[model samples]
Target: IENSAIALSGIVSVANNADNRLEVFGVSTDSAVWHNWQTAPLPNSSWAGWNKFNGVVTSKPAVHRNSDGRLEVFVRGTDNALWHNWQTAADTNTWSSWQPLYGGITSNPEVCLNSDGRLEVFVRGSDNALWHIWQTAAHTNSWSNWKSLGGTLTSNPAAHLNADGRIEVFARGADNALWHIWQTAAHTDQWSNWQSLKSVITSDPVVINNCDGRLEVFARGADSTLRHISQIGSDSVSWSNWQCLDGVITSAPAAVKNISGQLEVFARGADNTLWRTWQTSHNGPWSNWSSFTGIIASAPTVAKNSDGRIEVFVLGLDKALWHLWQTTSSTTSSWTTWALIGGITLIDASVIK
Candidate 1:
């Protein structure tokens, strides 16, 4: 991934293989592609091959087990068609033949299991409308017919399964406001209509469970501040009023709860530096932001890696990937030391490296 010889794109697809290795996928110089590194104390840094694409792959993988129990990656290929490739449980790199799913999908899809353990991919169709497609199992050759959820959408839709095991989707609606839809009962046609946040949004939303199992949504407001909206359950009608947590934001935030059940939200500040804010519990009043840290990278994505430790990944102005992590401090402690990942950032628009 150095010297621009292998320019990886902005999108990254990662899945835990049966062997417990993390298979990371991204679209590089060719069409869609994938890479993997067996999990280790530190990143192994070796990459797999580029499994050519049926079209331009803008979709980050919607990976989950297929009916046959193999792992699959679904993305919107350049042709504007939804495409898929799979690495069976019986073989690695020997991916199944790529297939173009019907319709022109534009947004990076958010895929998860439906109530029935089927794979559901949600994306902004060419019409700017939200659409969905699903299949019952892994390596599925046939997907259900494309289903459309009408509305003008701009940002990529983010979705999560509710506590009741039903799928819920949130997106920036036509009004540039937040909106959501949920499948409450058995009838798929009984989908809830999109309800506007009726408020301004500065960055995309990150919805996660507070320790209480209630649904909490976090986003930067149109004012460049952290904002929150939550519900006790699937009822979008009884939502909380908007609240700002404070900061100038520039990227979709990354969030994860610590062992103590504290929910922390990390994002790219206006300076392209890393900033954070947290609460002892989800849906609780957030503590004042501790302070901005990690100066080397632009905006970064933060997550709690397999070790139950926090890991942050970002791209510096030098077009290189950088890293930061929480030290093995006490559960009552905070994070330290933002390290650097070895590859240079992708320089070309096509190549994110």
Candidate 2:
């Protein structure tokens, strides 16, 4: 499974094209962005080799698929400004040249699509406030100027589209609590004030929408154990108190829903190996943490394949990309042995189906 083409220095970002082909991006060792795509959709598909983009980025790139199915990537430049590049059209390998979205950002950007189809990006600004910018219209390159969302964030933000189409963002606050803000209403720039889902966390939070539409968030607590909380009910503003998932994890969690709608979470355990837990049934109780042996150097990132199987990717201790995936779509527990997807990656990865 190894493709020994490029060495990357930041998190790898993954997205699917209009035709459902998977495309991946990473910042190269030289700071330039490089990408690779699946020659065809899912099962038995091969990569179409790595392609490089012209830019010197300082952070891992964040990628999102546009309303038109064009994929866009955002990164923090060496000058601390936000920069982006995108596919010229839906499902095309051809890309626009790197462009600036100019803002002094201090953390990697997080992106989510508005219900109306516009793309909005969130980042920790140099001032430690949550700041954002968005596409002026659906499926267009034009963007609005950066606006501060006002939060004293300590980690990069995570954004998610609510079941009702409103977008919500979560970040670790200065007090080590999970602080969140959301659109006051669906599809608008107006936002609610920052609210804390109190917890003493050590890593950034990761969130996923349950099969029934409640939002659930996971993070590494100050004790190095996993902690989680969920919206009290579908699309509810109130959330449950934090509960311990009890794994001595060393990295932030990456989560995805299986084809059957069971939520699964993966992270780098204290031993620097991949570990995971999953719901026994759709939105049901979670199983105990299970280990998948691989001496990894970064957080485990998971994505669902077009054929319905879930795959997990991570940067190995040797710096090369490695992955383990479901052998069949029938169960979350049956998986292939860890395999190498060779490339010396510098950070964890971001993945989308």
Candidate 3:
């Protein structure tokens, strides 16, 4: 089955509005717009968490729903500050509130609500130290003071909100391998003080919480094979050992969980095509890799549609928003028609077309 889609120029950072609506907050080569998804329509008449100002954008946005149930968006601002936006229960369709947390921040921001019922945001600082800002409120209207997490040199950190007592933050050290830092509610304030967990990291990783309260991370190793590192037990046990998967990947893998609590990973292949790996049931022994033939990948965001169907939005070689989504059910074996979603173009760098 096939479904219709709206096209955009060039969008990178994507997030969800309060009512589960789709929102993309990324940059395009054109100067006419930078953060244009802010004005798009989201459900429940509430759309929050995104900030747009007179400046060039860098890195994908990290957005999470606060304890107050409002969507909060964060990104490195023009002044190199971590700025945010959100909608109140009263008025969500148009979020006009802006909160600037810290300045001189850097790298991609990742946000997740910890098991302690607190909302936390992690980023790579100018010094490449893992910096953070968090709160306990549902909506974080009166978020507490931002704390300085002075630790070793870190960059491109990825944090996951697990079902257990806390969350884990992974990053690339100066050696270019993955390093980890974790904590629980008891040491909420001491999250900044993290110890290294992995002795070696051959590739960058992307992690997501599964329906079973387990955490799974996927990455492409130096050999170009897809590998997995997981925590299989419920909230009570430690994650399992790192296991190698069966496919080869050429780019960093990006992943997210569907409504069914299944973890789906999307990565760029050697041919620049989009490659997918999904767990058949809840946890696995995961299934084999499924390549969406004919369509090249520019890194995709896979999220369940309003009806709980998979919606895969990607960027085409032309840089416009192209999508190849499964409209009816999960048939990883089938390749539906690939169509254009938006008019935005993905021009390399700013000077080139």
Instruction: Name the best candidate (by TM-score).
Output: 2
For model 1, residues 247-317, the per-residue Cα lDDT tens digits are 66666567778777878877776666677777755446676655456553334555454456666666565
List model 2 lDDT by residue over 238-290, tens digit each.
89888887768776688888877788888887777788888887556789888
- TM-score of candidate 1 on Cα atoms, chains taken together: 0.81
Off by over 4 Å in 1: 1-13, 18-21, 29-34, 41-56, 59-71, 90-94, 138-141, 186-189, 290-299, 329-336, 347-353
Global lDDT of each model?
A: 0.62, 0.78, 0.58
Q: Model 2 — which ten-residue stretch has the worst lDDT?
A: 1-10
The runs of at least 3 residues in candidate 3 whose Cα sits more than 4 Å from the true structure, single-residue gaps closed, are: 1-11, 30-55, 88-92, 115-118, 197-203, 232-237, 258-262, 280-282, 295-297, 330-335, 346-353
Clashing pairs in 2: none
lDDT of 2: 0.78
Q: How accurate is candidate 1 locally (lDDT)?
A: 0.62
lDDT tens per residue, model 3, 9-82 = 11355555555566655555643223333233322223333334344544455667665556666766666677
TM-score of each: 0.81, 0.92, 0.79
